């Protein structure tokens, strides 16, 4: 479970408000939030690696309460 | 009272010979308000009947209510599509005749 | 399936007339008649709730298109295991009624909680609350009648109650399941959501008004979705 | 629930052989409140008694291949439909109800 | 004890069992069908279902999925029927109490375990759905009844008997297939065209062992049929019929191994000292021979099936035979119900052998990595679940032992009684003397 997939975001969000955002729950050890080079903008889906698995299963339970730019945030195991 | 009955006939194995169980298993009816059309005049309902290949068909219903019954059967719940379809339609699939009343 | 819509009511018809006209079919629990306070008269229709769904059914069959006070009336469904309803308003517009069957046979404590929250018989409930989280092809979540954002709600038993069992699975759209630590928050599924099996308690199903649930889903919220009325 | 069970089954034992209980009720207690068809448990009561009534039937030995045959016959004694219905709902929801081409009116 | 209650519980349990084996027969009709078919060829009278039903695996309208499991459930139903027979047996063999029922009124116990523990005791072990076997027969294992070469009744392993046979004929001119050809002999051939002389010792012994095997195999592969019924049937056929062998030329044969002109001399020969001697010495063997005969007849389909198998395997190659064996094996041991920077790593200090003792005596290839182990999910799980709380304090030592004493290293007022001696007296103690005072 150490990693999660996160959908439905707005590009003003970046890797930092994800950092800050999910460490509110529990620390994101490895952050991945693609920067698209071609048009220089984000599609808004994320992958998160944690310290171990327990962090991330609690993360499955609590985790999908985040709302990025008035809008819904997908978090599921991976 | 008084009710309406329609008898719609379909192809005689003429073109339906070219059968991959894709919704092949009945015609559907719905009551549409003329308030929306591809918008000149309106104000009456239509008893539209549709089947995949063939073209849609409509029948104007000026009377506010006819044959609108009251608990015909004894409340059995297989909604199919809606109360209208199960309540008052028959699909002779062997002969390809759709009756509606 | 206990609530009926009754239209075509003459001005002289009131709650007393309705009680007398429908009681021959069975005991009645409630009669509501919307009023226009500027005129002090009703708007020509009402909702009659029977104790038993079977009686409501017999009434529809014998009273639809019957005569009351000289004119023809219209009677139909407005929208052992309890059946409850929610009337939904989207933006400023009524959307219709969702009717739900609660599986008291499988999850009695969970079903009873939701039932009471529909009737308000314990002093609080769903009326006027919102569907605050709506995700297309997934689910419509509501029941947070205290905080309106997914952090609140309360059960009839206290803040929280146990997961009774996970017998009922998330097999398709139109199922009722508890959000969660059960309180009052719940969701209506919009597809098979089997990844939630064993995590959320499923406790009921939509019996009428799947189309109204689809209208809620269409807002997944872009516009406010409110439980304008509810009951049993 | 052992108490309730025991009293139900006992009053059921005597009731199986119906005057002793109707006398007990008038002689004695909110204990036998299940005697009235109002009290839910009453139903299960009607079961137990019947069962005991049955034991009185062949008070004769049972000398029952046959057992197998029987279980087969008991065995002998919806999904697809649901599926088809689903299909119908999908298609009905997915066709143009605005492709009108009417002929007459009634 | 009121017998009414006991007899009641008995009839109820019987009902429960019937319902169980009926549910089984329902999910997979084959269970009955299979059984019944065999029964058909043992007790000719038996009425059997419409062929269509058998094939489509249906009982009424619904065709059920085709299913080791069939046999399993058949043995389970076997033990069920045993229970039933027992209960049926024992079964064949007011205010006073209601007052004593008042005993021990004050118990806070929920009691929902009489019909539920039974219904459950006999229904289709695991948490939810892993093992088809009921709690009743949770330790039932077919592999302890069938060998791998028998494949739960598919084949019967006769290679072993081919060995013993070679040992019996004192040569090697006999091949597995020629041995099976010999077995085929078994209503008159096995008697009038014997492989060996039927008065030979080695031979009679062999025949005994083989017969026993075939019989046990028979009843093993068809649990559902009443074994005692079959046994008695055969025995009565043996006694009542077996001058059963008659020839229009030689007359009547006797299993004395001689014929007889007419029935008359045949009867007056059954009292003679010769026949007395023989029937008194070779009785068990004759009877065993006969059993081998009739049981092999009842298993003709299995005999053929195996002979076929033999020829197949025989005509295989190496790889083929190997893969086939693999298949038989899998079928045997399967659940009855399915669910570059070289100097860089030295410089950075990695790929160097190291071990953490507290974690599964785990191995770590780098010192930076092991230093990162100190803050981890699993490491903290071992600590905290071990009873050693997770904090920096312990972020050094690996061995489980030392941190236990470290955690032991990690983990009183005076209320003045009135006699002026209670200045040594504790708060709670003086409160207790408040309650006493």
Curated annotation (Swiss-Prot), chain A:
- Phosphotyrosine occurs at 45
Q: Which residues form a coiled coil?
A: none
- Which intervals hold domain RRM? 2-78
- Source organism superkingdom: Eukaryota
Q: Where in the cell is it found?
A: Nucleus
Protein's job? Component of the 17S U2 SnRNP complex of the spliceosome, a large ribonucleoprotein complex that removes introns from transcribed pre-mRNAs. The 17S U2 SnRNP complex (1) directly participates in early spliceosome assembly and (2) mediates recognition of the intron branch site during pre-mRNA splicing by promoting the selection of the pre-mRNA branch-site adenosine, the nucleophile for the first step of splicing.
Question: Which family is it part of?
Answer: Belongs to the SF3B4 family.
In the UniProt entry, the disease listed is: Acrofacial dysostosis 1, Nager type: A form of acrofacial dysostosis, a group of disorders which are characterized by malformation of the craniofacial skeleton and the limbs. The major facial features of AFD1 include downslanted palpebral fissures, midface retrusion, and micrognathia, the latter of which often requires the placement of a tracheostomy in early childhood. Limb defects typically involve the anterior (radial) elements of the upper limbs and manifest as small or absent thumbs, triphalangeal thumbs, radial hyoplasia or aplasia, and radioulnar synostosis.
Q: Could you tell me what this protein is called?
A: Splicing factor 3B subunit 4
Complete-protein stretch covered: 12 to 89 of 424
From Swiss-Prot, chain B:
User: What this chain does, per the record?
Assistant: Component of the 17S U2 SnRNP complex of the spliceosome, a large ribonucleoprotein complex that removes introns from transcribed pre-mRNAs. The 17S U2 SnRNP complex (1) directly participates in early spliceosome assembly and (2) mediates recognition of the intron branch site during pre-mRNA splicing by promoting the selection of the pre-mRNA branch-site adenosine, the nucleophile for the first step of splicing.
Please name every pair of cysteines joined by a disulfide bond in this record.
none
Which family does the record assign? Belongs to the SF3A2 family.
Please identify the protein, giving its name as recorded: Splicing factor 3A subunit 2
The organism encoding this protein is Homo sapiens (Human)
Q: Which domain of life is it from?
A: Eukaryota
Q: Which residues carry this modification: Phosphoserine?
A: 33
| Protein location | Nucleus
- Subunit (UniProt): Component of the 17S U2 SnRNP complex, a ribonucleoprotein complex that contains small nuclear RNA (snRNA) U2 and a number of specific proteins. Part of the SF3A subcomplex of the 17S U2 SnRNP complex which is composed of three subunits; SF3A3/SAP61, SF3A2/SAP62 and SF3A1/SAP114. SF3A associates with the splicing factor SF3B and a 12S RNA unit to form the mature 17S U2 small nuclear ribonucleoprotein complex (17S U2 snRNP). Identified in the spliceosome 'E' complex, a precursor of the spliceosome 'A' complex. Identified in the spliceosome 'A' and 'B' complexes.
From Swiss-Prot, chain C:
- Provide the E.C. number(s) assigned to this enzyme: 5.2.1.8
Family membership:
Belongs to the cyclophilin-type PPIase family. PPIase E subfamily.
Q: Which GO terms describe its biological process?
A: mRNA splicing, via spliceosome; positive regulation of viral genome replication; protein folding; regulation of DNA-templated transcription
Protein name listed in UniProt: Peptidyl-prolyl cis-trans isomerase E
What positions does the domain RRM occupy?
A: 2-79
Could you state a single Gene Ontology molecular function term?
cyclosporin A binding
Tissue specificity annotation: Found in all the examined tissues including heart, brain, placenta, lung, liver, skeletal muscle, kidney and pancreas.
Outcome of mutating residue 47 to D: Abolishes interaction with KMT2A. Abolishes inhibition of KMT2A activity
Subunit structure, interactors included? Identified in the spliceosome C complex. Component of the XAB2 complex, a multimeric protein complex composed of XAB2, PRPF19, AQR, ZNF830, ISY1, and PPIE. Identified in a pentameric intron-binding (IB) complex composed of AQR, XAB2, ISY1, ZNF830 and PPIE that is incorporated into the spliceosome as a preassembled complex. The IB complex does not contain PRPF19. Interacts (via RNA-binding domain) with KMT2A (via the third PHD-type zinc-finger).
Question: Which positions form S-S bridges?
Answer: none
Main location, first listed in the record: nucleus
Q: Which organism is it from?
A: Homo sapiens (Human)
The encoding gene is: PPIE
Q: Which reaction does it catalyse?
A: [protein]-peptidylproline (omega=180) = [protein]-peptidylproline (omega=0)
Q: What is the effect of changing residue 43 to A?
A: No effect on interaction with KMT2A
Group of enzyme by EC: isomerase
Changing residue 138 to A: what effect? Expected to disrupt proline isomerase activity. Abolishes inhibition of KMT2A activity
According to the record, mutating residue 133 to A results in: Expected to disrupt proline isomerase activity. Abolishes inhibition of KMT2A activity
- As given in the record, the signal peptide range reads none
**Which locations, inside or outside the cell, does it occupy?**
Nucleus
Curated annotation (Swiss-Prot), chain D:
> Where in the body, by tissue, does this protein show up?
Ubiquitously expressed.
Where is the site described as Critical for binding to SF3A3 found in this chain? 10
Tell me where the SURP motif repeats sit in this chain.
7-45
State where the protein is found.
Nucleus; Nucleus speckle
Assembly state and interactors? Component of the 17S U2 SnRNP complex, a ribonucleoprotein complex that contains small nuclear RNA (snRNA) U2 and a number of specific proteins. Part of the SF3A subcomplex of the 17S U2 SnRNP complex which is composed of three subunits; SF3A3/SAP61, SF3A2/SAP62 and SF3A1/SAP114. SF3A associates with the splicing factor SF3B and a 12S RNA unit to form the mature 17S U2 small nuclear ribonucleoprotein complex (17S U2 snRNP). SF3A1 functions as a scaffold that interacts directly with both SF3A2 and SF3A3. Identified in the spliceosome 'E' complex, a precursor of the spliceosome 'A' complex.
Q: What is the stated purpose of this protein?
A: Component of the 17S U2 SnRNP complex of the spliceosome, a large ribonucleoprotein complex that removes introns from transcribed pre-mRNAs. The 17S U2 SnRNP complex (1) directly participates in early spliceosome assembly and (2) mediates recognition of the intron branch site during pre-mRNA splicing by promoting the selection of the pre-mRNA branch-site adenosine, the nucleophile for the first step of splicing.
- What free text does the record give on domains? SURP motif 2 mediates direct binding to SF3A3.
Q: Kindly provide the name given to this protein in its UniProt entry.
A: Splicing factor 3A subunit 1
């Amino acid at each position: 479970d150490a990693t999660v997939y996160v959908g439905g975001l707005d590009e003003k969000v970046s890797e930092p408000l994800l950092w800050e955002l999910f460490l509110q729950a529990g620390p994101v050890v490895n952050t991945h939030m693609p920067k698209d080079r071609v048009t220089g903008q984000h599609q808004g889906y994320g992958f998160v690696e944690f310290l171990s698995e327990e962090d991330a299963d609690y993360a499955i339970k609590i985790m999908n309460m985040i709302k990025l730019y008035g809008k819904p945030i997908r978090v599921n195991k991976a | 009272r008084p009710g309406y009955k329609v008898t719609k006939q379909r192809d005689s194995e003429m073109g339906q010979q070219s059968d991959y169980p894709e919704i092949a298993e009945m015609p559907r009816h719905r009551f549409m308000s003329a308030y929306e059309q591809r918008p000149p005049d309106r104000r009456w309902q239509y008893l539209l009947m549709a089947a995949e290949p063939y073209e849609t068909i409509a029948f104007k219903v000026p009377s506010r209510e006819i044959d609108k019954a009251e608990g015909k059967f004894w409340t059995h719940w297989n909604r199919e599509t809606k109360q209208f379809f199960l309540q008052f339609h028959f699909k002779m699939e062997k002969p390809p005749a759709p009756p509606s009343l | 399936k206990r609530v009926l819509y009754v239209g075509g009511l003459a001005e002289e018809v009131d709650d007393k007339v309705l009680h007398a006209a429908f009681i021959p079919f069975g005991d009645i629990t409630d009669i509501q008649i919307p009023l226009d306070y500027e005129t002090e008269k009703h708007r020509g229709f009402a909702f009659v709730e029977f104790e038993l769904a079977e009686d409501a059914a017999a009434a529809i069959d014998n009273m639809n298109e019957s005569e009351l006070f000289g004119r023809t009336i219209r009677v139909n469904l407005a929208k052992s295991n309890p059946q409850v309803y929610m009337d939904i308003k989207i933006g400023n517009k009524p959307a219709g009624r969702i009717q739900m069957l609660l599986r008291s046979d499988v999850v009695p404590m969970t079903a009873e909680n939701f039932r009471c929250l529909c009737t308000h018989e314990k002093g609080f409930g769903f009326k006027g609350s919102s569907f605050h989280r709506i995700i297309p092809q997934f689910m419509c979540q509501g029941g947070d009648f205290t905080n309106h954002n997914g952090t609140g709600g309360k059960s009839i038993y206290g803040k929280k109650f146990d997961d009774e069992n996970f017998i009922l699975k998330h097999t398709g759209p139109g199922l009722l399941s508890m959000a969660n630590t059960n309180g009052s928050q719940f969701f209506l599924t919009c597809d098979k959501t089997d990844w939630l099996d064993g995590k959320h308690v499923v406790f009921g199903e939509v019996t009428e008004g799947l189309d109204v649930l689809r209208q809620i889903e269409a807002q997944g919220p872009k516009q406010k979705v409110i439980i304008a009325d509810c009951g049993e | 629930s052992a108490f309730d069970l025991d009293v139900v089954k006992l009053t059921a034992q005597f009731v199986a052989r119906r005057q002793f209980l109707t006398q007990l009720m008038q002689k004695e207690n909110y204990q036998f409140d299940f005697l009235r068809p109002q009290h839910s448990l009453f139903n299960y009561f009607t079961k137990l008694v019947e069962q005991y009534t049955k034991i009185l039937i062949p008070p004769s030995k049972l000398k029952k291949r046959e057992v197998l045959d029987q279980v087969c016959y008991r065995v002998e004694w919806r999904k697809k439909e649901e599926e088809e219905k689903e299909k119908e709902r999908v298609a009905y929801a997915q066709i143009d109800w605005h492709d009108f081409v009417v002929v007459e009116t009634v | 004890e009121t017998i009414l209650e006991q007899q009641r519980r008995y009839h109820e349990e019987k009902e429960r069992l019937m319902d169980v084996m009926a549910k089984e027969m329902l999910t997979k009709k084959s269970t009955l069908r299979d059984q019944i078919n065999s029964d058909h060829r043992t007790r000719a009278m038996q009425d059997r279902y419409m062929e269509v039903s058998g094939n489509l695996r249906d009982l009424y309208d619904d065709k059920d999925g085709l299913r080791a499991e069939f046999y399993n459930r058949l043995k389970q139903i076997k033990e069920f029927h045993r229970k039933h027979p027992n209960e049926i047996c024992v079964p064949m063999s007011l205010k006073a109490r209601e007052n004593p029922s008042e005993e021990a009124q004050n118990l806070v116990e929920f009691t929902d375990e009489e019909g539920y523990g039974r219904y459950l005791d006999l229904h289709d072990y695991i948490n939810l759905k892993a093992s088809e076997k009921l709690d009743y027969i949770t330790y039932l294992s077919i592999f302890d009844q069938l060998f791998d070469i028998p494949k739960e009744r598919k084949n019967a392993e006769y290679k072993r008997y081919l060995e013993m046979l070679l040992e019996y004929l004192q040569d090697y001119t006999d091949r597995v297939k020629p041995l099976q050809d010999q077995n085929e002999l078994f209503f008159e051939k096995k008697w009038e065209n014997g492989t060996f002389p039927g008065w030979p010792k080695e031979t009679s012994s062999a025949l005994t062992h083989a017969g026993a095997h075939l019989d046990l195999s028979a009843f093993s592969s068809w649990e559902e049929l009443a074994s005692l019924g079959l046994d008695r049937l055969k025995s009565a056929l043996l006694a009542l019929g077996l001058g059963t062998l008659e020839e229009r030329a030689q007359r009547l044969f006797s299993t004395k191994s001689l014929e007889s002109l007419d029935t008359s001399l045949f009867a007056k020969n059954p009292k003679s000292k010769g026949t007395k001697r023989d029937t008194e010495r070779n009785k068990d063997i004759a009877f065993l021979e006969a059993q081998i005969y009739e049981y092999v007849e009842i298993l003709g389909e299995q005999r053929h099936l195996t002979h076929e198998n033999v020829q197949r395997k025989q005509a295989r190659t190496g790889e083929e035979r190997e893969e086939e064996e693999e298949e038989q094996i899998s079928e045997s041991e399967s659940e009855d119900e399915e669910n570059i920077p070289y100097w860089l790593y030295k410089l950075h200090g990695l790929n160097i052998n190291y071990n953490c003792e507290i974690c599964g005596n785990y191995t770590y290839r780098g010192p930076k990595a092991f230093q990162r182990h100190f803050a981890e999910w699993r490491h903290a799980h071992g600590m905290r679940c071990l009873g050693i709380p997770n904090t920096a304090h312990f972020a050094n030592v690996t061995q489980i032992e030392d941190a236990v004493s470290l955690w032991a290293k990690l983990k009183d007022t005076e209320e003045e009684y009135e006699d002026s001696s209670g200045n040594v007296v504790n708060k709670k103690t003086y409160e207790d003397l408040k309650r006493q005072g």
